[PDB]
Amino acid sequence: NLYFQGTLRAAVFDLDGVLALPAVFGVLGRTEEALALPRGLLNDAFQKGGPEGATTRLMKGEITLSQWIPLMEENCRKNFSIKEIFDKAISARKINRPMLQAALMLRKKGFTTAILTNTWLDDRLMCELKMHFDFLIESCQVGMVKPEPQIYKFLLDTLKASPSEVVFLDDIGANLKPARDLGMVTILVQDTDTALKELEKVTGIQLLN
Numbered sequence: 001n002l003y004f005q006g007t008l009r010a011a012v013f014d015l016d017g018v019l020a021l022p023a024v025f026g027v028l029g030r031t032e033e034a035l036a037l038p039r040g041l042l043n044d045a046f047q048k049g050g051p052e053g054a055t056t057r058l059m060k061g062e063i064t065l066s067q068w069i070p071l072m073e074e075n076c077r078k079n080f081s082i083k084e085i086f087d088k089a090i091s092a093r094k095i096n097r098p099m100l101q102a103a104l105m106l107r108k109k110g111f112t113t114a115i116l117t118n119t120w121l122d123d124r125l126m127c128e129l130k131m132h133f134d135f136l137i138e139s140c141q142v143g144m145v146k147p148e149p150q151i152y153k154f155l156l157d158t159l160k161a162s163p164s165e166v167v168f169l170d171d172i173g174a175n176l177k178p179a180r181d182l183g184m185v186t187i188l189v190q191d192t193d194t195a196l197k198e199l200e201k202v203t204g205i206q207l208l209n
């Protein structure tokens with residue numbers, strides 16, 4: 001193909017909500033329910049400030065987990081423990097086995113695979129995943145966060161791939177928008193079985209049955 005490579009050759013997976021469960025937003029919704037807080041209250045506090053908010057600064061590696069905790073508690077006030085809510089949920093994270101198996105099968109079939117995720121520095125599971133993927137890109141290690149355009153350029157430069165050769169799976173639609181704009185294939189992971197059927201369709205690799 002002189003001009004354009006439309007056959008997929010790389011598969012990029014988000015971590016929380018895709019390769020590992022649960023994602024934080026569900027965590028917070030179920031916490032609102034359990035504590036009888038107004039719905040969306042914790043998820044609003046979590047995202048307060050947008051690109052300048054405490055959570056983006058944590059994902060970018062600008063601040064550490066210990067610095068973030070009292071900022072999140074302040075956002076909540078703007079008697080539960082943020083430290084406990086997050087430590088309990090993070091301790092209970094589990095690999096999404098059907099998703100991991102699909103990633104391994106794509107790699108066996110010659111795909112370059114990568115993890116691209118927003119994550120945090122804990123100043124107080126990844127080793128396993130690392131050996132089974134070609135690349136691991138963590139927001140707080142590179143100093144960039146999804147959905148900033150930059151980190152998608154970094155991903156493509158790391159893969160040495162054009163956007164049309166890449167399929168990207170994420171639980172968050174905002175994170176797929178820049179990839180879809182660049183011409184990547186995108187899959188929104190709301191339910192793992194539907195996402196795998198869609199991944200089978202676009203790659204032509206059997207992943208189900």
Ligand SMILES: O=C(O)c1cccc(-c2nc(-c3ccc(Cl)c(Cl)c3)c(-c3ccccc3)o2)c1
Nearest residue numbers: 016022023024027086089090093118120146172
């Ligand atoms: O989907 C995204 O792009 C996204 C964006 C911003 C934050 C996060 C985010 N996820 C987590 C997270 C992942 C798994 C678990 Cl089980 C939990 Cl409890 C949290 C934390 C996070 C934020 C502050 C402290 C620790 C983690 O931050 C994820």
Ligand SMILES: [Mg+2]
Nearest residue numbers: 014016017171
């Ligand atoms: Mg996610």
